[PDB]
Amino acid sequence: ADFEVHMLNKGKDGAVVFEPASLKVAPGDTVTFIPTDKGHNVETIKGMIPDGAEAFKSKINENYKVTFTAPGVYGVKCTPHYGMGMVGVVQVGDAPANLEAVKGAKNPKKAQERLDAALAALGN
Ligand SMILES: [Cu+2]
Task: Tell me: is residue 86 an annotated ligand-binding position.
Answer: yes
Q: What is the DSSP string of 80-117?
A: GGTTTT-EEEEEESSS-TTHHHHHTS---HHHHHHHHH
Domains of the chain from N-terminus onward? 1-124 (2.60.40.420)
- Edge-to-edge order in the sheet of strand 72-77: 22-25, 87-92, 72-77, 43-44
The residues facing 43 across adjacent strands are: 57, 77
> What number of other Cβ atoms are within 10 A of residue 54's Cβ?
8
Using the mean position of ligand 1's atoms as its centre, give its distance from the Cα of residue 123 in Å.
25
Resolution attained, angstroms:
1.0
Q: How far, in Å, is the centroid of ligand 1 from the Cα of 71?
A: 26
Residues 6+ apart with CB under 8 A from 103: 119
Solved using:
X-ray
